[PDB]
């Protein structure tokens, strides 16, 4: 549930998002800031230090696919429970990720948008994105309910 | 906090300096817009954009955090009075400290993009978590 | 979401619940164990000590309404979003209660059932009741999502 | 913990006594059934009812909680090695310390009806939250 002038500032800002870097940036910062999330990602190799994680080819690659799922959710903000049906099944039944972690990745993305977009990332823009990331987080957690 | 954590926080907050209060006010404003359940704790405030009351409270929060960094090793005795105020008298829900800590990070990132490395991000989060634990310690 | 032997154990134990007292013992325990919750019940009067809360007659009276709402949930386990749509609006848009507190009241309800049934409140029975309370907390949170 | 909370914790835990190991086994069993995501941490255990291993691990959890009760004032140094195991080596998600604490409270409620007052309920939650704060302090 976004207003017309929220949905237009959300979609405006996304078109300027370097889809290559931000995704790896968001996934790398989650693993360093909340180190328990590293146990879901053992096959990605060396996550021993902050430089090992950010410079890690599989993290940077996997980040493109995360940001790419975020891109598809904006397009269909009226049917997230649908868009994210397959990823809900993966994350909740196969992997067993605690839904608190969906919120933390949403919140680390917001910190990263603020890092790149600076003063263009205004408090009212942030309040519109905080609505998006919660909606994503609840869509992913639907297979637990 | 660890030796490396202390160093990253002191360094980052050193380069905030005079902007301390301006940054505090922006974090409260981001809080009030992103999480509207926090507005109920300030019924006696003008919470509209540019509000003089939010600017003055901004500086009070900032000055409380500056003392915390300057007393990093003795944090429960540098913030003892504010746990009483926040827990016993105001009954501030513990989730809300996590919401302010997150808006304080979105502010430090928008303004200090060169200092907001992933290692400094991790150090500030542990610091604001510690500050949050002390202010909820009367629960 | 409840097996047939689950739903039958849930229903069988509920029928034996003192509807006059359990809802007040649960609401009273929320207010003593998690004191920030006392700021939403300012007008219920004296909540200054543990003994004031448990014997406060507004707390017992309102405790019966809360339990009534749960009985109504148990009767409609397949449509919880629809049964609690009005209560969700009250708690979410008017009262501004954080959704985490809904989980805390549900978990406090589970402690109180164990206090009263002792040995009968077996691990399998507890696990059927946890699904229910999680069901009810997610339904009350719907107007946020 | 306040002097009243220390007295309430010691009172309750005194009455558990020799059955502490049995109660810790029941808490672990209640957690695996209620929150089946917690099982991902014990892939090297038989988690069927009455499993020798769960009884064995029940006694280790209980002996640690009794230690914590006998050292309530110096918990950080009594449990520091357990803080390293659970954060550094095992990488246990902090949300999981709240699910086991709740399952302990449910176990004590079911066994000690007379002792499980509102006042004692509240002091035990504070104590289990204190134990969870130390075990997740390397984060
Ligand atoms: C909040 C938004 C999140 C989104 C949008 C998201 C999205 C995705 C996507 C698109 C995939 C790839 C699926 C495929 O192509 O087969 C994936 C895989 C995965 N996700 Fe997430 N995810 C999120 C949160 C999380 C979190 C918080 C964790 C862990 C703490 C996590 C752990 C994983 C793991 C372990 C994989 C499998 C990687 C592999 O082994 O190939 N996800 N996620
Ligand atoms: C890092 C977190 C926080 C810090 C450091 C902090 C610090 C302070 C300080 C220094 C004061 C003023 C003390 C004085 O009068 O001298 C204060 C007041 C207050 N704080 Fe906080 N605070 C924090 C988080 C929160 C949060 C999350 C809330 C609510 C959502 C909150 C609500 C209040 C309220 C209502 C007042 C009193 C305003 C008035 O009536 O004048 N605080 N805080
Ligand atoms: C599963 C959890 C809960 C259920 C089933 C529940 C149910 C109810 C019901 C049936 C009412 C009465 C509605 C009416 O009379 O119009 C009510 C009112 C209320 N509830 Fe809840 N509730 C829950 C959780 C909470 C929590 C956690 C809080 C606060 C921390 C809360 C605060 C209130 C308040 C303030 C009222 C209005 C009281 C008044 O009439 O003055 N509720 N709730
Ligand atoms: C109050 C909370 C807890 C206490 C006091 C506690 C205590 C202990 C103790 C004493 C050990 C034995 C260490 C040794 O062998 O030297 C242990 C091991 C372990 N704990 Fe915990 N623990 C707690 C919570 C948790 C939680 C929440 C989880 C996961 C959900 C967990 C998972 C484990 C695992 C996987 C082991 C190692 C098992 C093995 O390899 O044999 N613990 N814990």
Numbering used by the authors:
A (entry chain DDD), C (entry chain BBB): 2 to 146
B (entry chain CCC), D (entry chain AAA): 2 to 140
Original authors' sentences:
In addition to collecting X-ray pump X-ray probe SFX data of haemoglobin microcrystals, we also collected diffraction data using a single pulse, in which case shockwave damage is necessarily precluded. We compare the quality of the diffraction data, as well as the crystal structures determined using the single-pulse and pump–probe data, respectively. Crystal structures extracted from the two data sets also differ.
